[PDB]
């Protein structure tokens, strides 16, 4: 019930004594009064207590929420997943689900815009509204430090931005994401966003802006990041393709075939699909 009572259960599960957690600034008696619900720890002492039981902040928050992710992350991940599966029916159900969930009016409006944008991306006959596009853009400009929620909004509404806003917000992404850039969820979305920026710039023929975002992707990618590395390799070839009337078509075809070594039929189809789509951009 109380935070101290919640913390105490966690400490006992970690099989730690109060003296194991205690350190400079946080005494066992302070931890005891905290666990008894008779006093609250300061912000600095609270972070010591949580680090003292050796659980990640994601784990601490997960158990605090009864082993559910935060509502805004549950919605955003489901939207991304269902859009990636071209699941119009599930997106339409998410729209009514967002309308029935308890959240700030601003967040209800932003989630509806992303979902409606996704449905329109699958079904171009699904109507949109300019007032919604302006509301989301105004929001991204207003938030000074972009959390996972802003990365989710930006990454999935880029096709809908004017060139002016795409260029400015993509440039601002570099600075505005720095506060939370090291976190596991955020860094994954940053790499995916950078790949989507590269795609958008090519499709819009804004080729001169690509190097700024390739340099950022270069700094972020680790040897583990095989999927993003191969995606970037493919997009470098697509940029040449779109700038030279398809001159490197055979090289791209050979590259996709060589991905058979990965024995990943879904991945091969993904690149084959994008290649066929980009072929429609040249005469």
């Amino acid at each position: 019930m109380e935070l101290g009572e919640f913390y105490k259960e966690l400490r006992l599960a970690r099989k730690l004594k109060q003296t194991d957690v205690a350190c400079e600034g946080l005494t066992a008696s302070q931890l005891s009064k905290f666990e008894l619900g008779q006093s609250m720890l300061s912000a600095d002492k609270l972070i010591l207590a949580i680090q003292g039981i050796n659980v990640t902040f994601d784990e601490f928050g997960h158990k605090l929420n009864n082993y559910q992710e935060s509502p805004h992350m549950r919605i955003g991940r489901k939207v991304v997943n269902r859009f990636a599966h071209q699941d119009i029916a599930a997106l339409e159900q998410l729209l009514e689900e967002v309308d029935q969930e308890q959240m700030a009016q601003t967040y209800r409006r932003l989630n509806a815009i992303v979902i409606k944008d996704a449905i329109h991306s699958l079904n171009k006959s699904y109507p949109l509204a300019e007032e919604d596009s302006e509301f989301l853009t105004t929001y991204l400009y207003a938030i000074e430090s972009w959390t996972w929620f802003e990365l989710y909004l930006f990454c999935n509404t880029m096709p809908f931005l004017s060139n002016q806003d795409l260029i400015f917000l993509s440039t601002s992404l570099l600075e505005k994401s720095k506060e939370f850039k090291e976190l596991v969820h955020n860094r994954l979305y940053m790499k995916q966003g950078l790949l989507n920026i590269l795609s958008e710039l090519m499709e819009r023929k804004l080729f001169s802006y690509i190097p700024i975002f390739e340099a950022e992707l270069e700094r972020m990618l680790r040897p583990y990041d095989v999927f993003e590395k191969v995606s970037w390799q493919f997009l470098k070839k697509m940029s040449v393709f779109l700038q030279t009337k398809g001159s490197n078509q055979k090289e791209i075809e050979r590259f996709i075939q060589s991905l058979q070594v990965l024995e990943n039929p879904q991945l091969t189809s993904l690149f084959e699909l994008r290649f066929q789509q980009y072929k429609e951009l040249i005469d």
Copy 2:
């Protein structure tokens, strides 16, 4: 900076540009949030998480900012181990051992982090012993913790050479059940997949081939099409198992497989598999 949790929350709420009434919902009133921010009352566990999710900040983001954007001691050590191991820097790893000894953490954690470091030193210098007292301490701890958090997944994944054959099998078997509490989390799920890959590697190295199918079944259940690195690693390990059980019958297929990875322009991945391939060749048969 020394401040109450409510004042810290208020800084965040203003950065999210929400009013107290925007955050308020069922379970959390605006007045409750206000007295929280004013330091006049503390929120219960349920109300605190409502206040944080109500401003669309993850608890990971909340804790990161609360900790002045500093990494966890256990992740800071793990990152330094990774960096220094990649440069084959035994001296720097040994300096990390003395640095851990003065770190602000429980004694148990100082010892366990040291064991992770020693595993790296032993991987670089096989004549560096794996003390039995360390093996006993590690084994007792992993058996004792009923629910394995990210720390135990990280610890287990990086200390397998300290385990006896029996404890490797028992603890590998226990990974499946003991990780379930936090298994869905993104970081934990990554380390469980890596741990399963390392389980397969250890079993092959120890010639315990009959136990491999149990853990391949778990890897099959967990791997997604996005998981390209884990999938290719498993593909490589499947060939290593066939190689070791058939007197090298598929060596040409393995050589062609490594050559076919040239397309990824990833020398670290290619070097990883070539080095491991040579290690398995050096086993006795």
